[PDB]
């Protein structure tokens, strides 16, 4: 709902933008949920940031998988890219690669060259579904 969301991002720099993009991706991707949770920065501090967490559908060789991810929105959003992770369940393992480290953090050209209004969440997820579709970031263990 537009109301509950507006309250979550109370302490955001650009709330009107952040919510409208948020509403759009949650609509299109029914299984991504907005959530508050403390993020720990490189310095050691903890701000309470919104986290679009859930799964996205990703075709991989004839089969569609629900790849689990985390999209951390900084409070300066949309003028900085989200901080993106894959969130492997305990039965999955992270496939390390060019776009993924062992902590599950995602690295993409789209994130690097992020620029508002040129870039937004919907665009990022579109790209993700392509990158993971070619090279899955997570695999299920035997």
């Amino acid at each position: 709902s537009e109301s509950q969301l507006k309250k979550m991002v109370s302490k955001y720099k650009y709330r009107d933008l952040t919510v409208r993009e948020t509403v759009n991706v949650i609509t299109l991707y029914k299984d991504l949920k907005p959530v508050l949770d403390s993020y720990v920065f490189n310095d050691g501090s903890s701000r309470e940031l919104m986290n679009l967490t859930g799964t996205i559908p990703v075709p991989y060789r004839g089969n569609t998988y629900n790849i689990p991810i985390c999209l951390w929105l900084l409070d300066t959003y949309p003028y900085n890219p989200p901080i993106c992770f894959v969130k492997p369940t305990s039965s999955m393992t992270i496939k390390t690669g060019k776009h993924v480290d062992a902590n599950g953090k995602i690295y993409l050209p789209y994130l690097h060259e992020w620029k508002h209004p040129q870039s937004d969440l919907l665009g990022l997820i579109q790209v993700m579904i392509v990158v993971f579709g070619d090279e899955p970031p997570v695999f299920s263990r035997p």
Binding site: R61, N63, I67
Partner: peptide
């Protein structure tokens, strides 16, 4: 509710 899934390790 959807369960997360990933391709099986071969």
């Amino acid at each position: 509710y959807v369960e997360p899934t990933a391709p099986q390790v071969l």
